[PDB]
Design a protein around this ligand. Structure first.
Ligand SMILES: CC(=O)N[C@@H]1[C@@H](O[C@@H]2O[C@H](CO)[C@H](O)[C@H](O)[C@H]2O)[C@H](O)[C@@H](CO)O[C@@H]1O
Ligand SMILES: [Ca+2]
Ligand code: NA
Ligand code: NA
Length: 407
């Protein structure tokens, strides 16, 4: 009867998840009609509607997308406050969303403005770090490095066999990379200082070491085809180098299995997962808790019906549908009885001296002509191409961060 418009980003977990979730919600609430749209370019799909005033009612699109639409709408104050959804009952169950959510998932990612208001409800619960061919390392006797000195020495040995040490799909995948690396060096509070634009945080030795370590990685041990493929159309080709054995490591999450399931691979390939190495021996290594976001535009016409469907996305019925391709909703018990192909990822949490890290940059203030994500993530391509020095990389980060601190 009543029509709801839902637009969901199609990623490594696939688009058939939302087709099956929408149909299940329409089975529970037959008076609700959901016009589902899935696309790998959500902004280009819904922009004609937003330009014509026909906004979607609910959008699944986490931060760090290629278009940056979620961050743009947060800057423009165009995303509805959905704090009340936490206290809403999940359709078909006798519990609230806040009761089912895992502890600590509400933070700077879900509350980008820094307060207790939730604007981006957490989607998925994927650990992020480095993925590799477990078989290739074992056949060459190469142990998984825990430090970057072991990492660079491994890159020297791999190049003698025609293998580059490092690659990445797009430069945006350094969000989880730096989240772990910054917490590896400076610690928990230091990472929060970076996300909250603490004064002169990028002039600290901890922040300089994270950039210098990433500098040597992308200027010497990078696959020569990485930058040329670091786009929305060719990012799977950089990931394909891992399956072909031409690259050893790349930063990614649990969606990589279903995303590359039909791709060719070296004989006996097996997915390996590990946290991002730290700098010091025996130091704590962090695993990034990568979540996406579901939200409601401020210009949506059917906000109440979208809130009830958003609460349904945390039901057990929707969780079982999402988990078929590796998408683990951030609800309790969802890491129990995990699929076999997810075990190699979540078992990394059981390693010694390994903690979790989560969050993104604070959207509490905006400065004209400055994006801190471009100066840290997107700048990796310029650094790898040789157009940006280590000092220039650090100076622009400090200038933009301190400018956001004063705003
Ligand atoms: C190129 C692309 O769209 N890849 C998506 C991926 O989005 C990327 O996620 C990483 C996370 O480290 C980073 O934020 C990057 O900027 C994003 O483009 C999705 O996370 C997954 C799962 O939805 O599907 C694709 O791989
Ligand atoms: Ca120091
Ligand atoms: Na997962
Ligand atoms: Na999977």
């Amino acid at each position: 009867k009543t029509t709801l418009k839902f637009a969901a980003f199609e990623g490594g977990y696939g688009a058939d998840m939302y087709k099956e979730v929408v149909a299940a919600y329409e089975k529970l609430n037959p008076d609700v009609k959901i016009e589902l749209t899935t696309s790998k370019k959500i902004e280009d799909e819904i922009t004609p509607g937003m330009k014509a005033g026909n906004y979607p009612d609910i959008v699944e699109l986490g931060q760090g997308s290629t278009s940056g639409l979620t961050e743009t709408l947060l800057k423009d104050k165009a995303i509805e406050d959905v704090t009340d959804v936490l206290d809403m009952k999940v359709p078909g169950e006798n519990k609230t969303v806040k009761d089912k959510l895992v502890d600590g998932v509400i933070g700077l990612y879900t509350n980008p403005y820094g307060g207790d208001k939730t604007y981006l409800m957490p989607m998925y619960y994927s650990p992020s770090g480095l993925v590799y061919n477990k078989t290739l390392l074992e056949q060459n006797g190469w142990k998984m490095p825990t430090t970057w000195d072991e990492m660079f020495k491994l890159g020297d040995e791999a190049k003698a066999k025609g293998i580059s040490l490092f690659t990445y799909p797009t430069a945006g995948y350094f969000d989880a990379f730096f989240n772990a690396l910054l917490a590896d060096i400076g610690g928990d509070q230091f990472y929060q200082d970076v996300m909250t634009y603490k004064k002169d945080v990028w002039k600290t030795d901890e922040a300089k070491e994270a950039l210098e370590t990433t500098y040597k990685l992308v200027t010497e041990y990078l696959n020569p085809d990485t930058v040329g493929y670091a786009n929305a159309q060719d990012f799977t080709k950089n990931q394909q180098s891992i399956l072909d054995g031409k690259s050893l490591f790349m930063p990614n999450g649990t969606w990589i299995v279903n995303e590359m399931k039909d791709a060719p691979r070296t004989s006996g390939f097996e997915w390996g997962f590990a946290p991002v190495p730290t700098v010091k021996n025996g130091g704590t290594r962090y695993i990034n808790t990568t979540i996406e976001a579901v939200w409601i535009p401020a210009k949506a016409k059917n906000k109440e019906a979208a809130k009830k469907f958003m609460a349904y996305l945390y039901s057990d019925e929707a969780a079982s549908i999402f988990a078929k391709t590796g998408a683990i909703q951030p609800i309790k018990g969802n890491t129990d009885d995990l699929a076999s192909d997810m075990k190699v990822f979540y078992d990394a949490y059981n390693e010694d001296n390994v903690k979790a890290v989560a969050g993104s940059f604070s959207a509490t203030a905006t400065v004209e002509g400055k994006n801190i994500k471009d100066d840290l993530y997107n700048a990796v391509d310029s650094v790898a191409s040789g157009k940006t020095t280590l000092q220039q990389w650090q100076d622009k980060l400090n200038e933009t961060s301190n400018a956001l601190n004063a705003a």
